[PDB]
């Protein structure tokens, strides 16, 4: 796969703590860092292999040739999602934030402003 690249605003996050996901945040910082700083250091590939020259200097011969062909012909597996429904579980809770909560909230908020006008006046 890749890397999620995304943005972290730390006073925002941490404060958010809607109880059913709150806990994750506090832990989530520390978990992320582990991966973050670690991956930054490592290299992703190792050295490469000149099988011919090594083979010529081996005396248990044809084995290296076997391993060589099999290695070069071979592909290793990959690692895969348990969860790309989380991706979507967002947009649903985002409906929760906006429309559901937004609108009824928005109306209240606006009114107070207009209200304040007159109660300044």
């Amino acid at each position: 796969r890749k890397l999620a690249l995304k943005t972290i605003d730390w006073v925002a996050f941490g404060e958010i703590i809607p109880r059913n996901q709150k806990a994750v945040a506090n832990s989530l910082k520390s978990w992320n860092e582990t991966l973050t700083s670690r991956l930054a250091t490592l290299p992703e590939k190792p050295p490469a292999i000149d099988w011919a020259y090594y083979k010529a200097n081996v005396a248990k011969a044809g084995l290296v040739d076997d391993f060589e062909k099999k290695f070069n012909a071979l592909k290793v597996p990959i690692p895969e999602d348990k969860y790309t429904a989380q991706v979507d579980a967002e947009e649903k809770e985002d409906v929760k934030s906006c429309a559901e909560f937004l609108t009824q909230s928005k109306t209240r908020i606006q009114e107070y402003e207009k209200e304040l006008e007159k109660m300044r006046n």
Binding site: W10, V11, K29, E33, S37
Partner: protein, 127 residues
């Protein structure tokens, strides 16, 4: 020089009075701070074995303490900070670290950032 000058000096002062008391106590606040700080600074000159460092980090972290920041902080958690912070600026503010490195020095601006970073970072480190 920018971070150290004061520190060398501070440690000096700290040291005689570091040596003073500790008789299950100490006395005036001024000095008490120096001690607290001092103690911190002591950690700052520390380093585990198998742990050589880069100057920018070093200056950086020193900058924090110098700038009177972690003197609030308590000693095991300094150590903890130090790590956290360090990997943090490396991570995040490698940019900045880059800058400082680049300038070969802290710049007031680099400072301004640093401080800022730090203060929040510090804040995060704590809270």
């Amino acid at each position: 020089k920018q971070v150290a000058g004061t520190m060398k000096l501070e440690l000096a002062q700290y040291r005689e009075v570091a040596a003073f008391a500790q008789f299950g106590s100490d006395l005036d606040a001024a000095t008490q701070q120096l001690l607290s700080r001092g103690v911190r600074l002591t950690e700052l000159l520390k380093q585990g074995q198998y742990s050589p460092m880069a100057i920018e980090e070093q200056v950086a972290v020193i900058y924090a303490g110098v700038r009177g920041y972690l003197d609030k902080l308590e000693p095991s958690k300094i150590t903890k900070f130090e790590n956290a912070f360090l990997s943090h600026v490396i991570s995040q503010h490698q940019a900045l670290l880059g800058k400082i490195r680049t300038d070969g020095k802290i710049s007031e601006e680099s400072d301004a950032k640093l401080k800022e970073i730090v203060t929040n970072f510090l804040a995060g480190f704590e809270a």
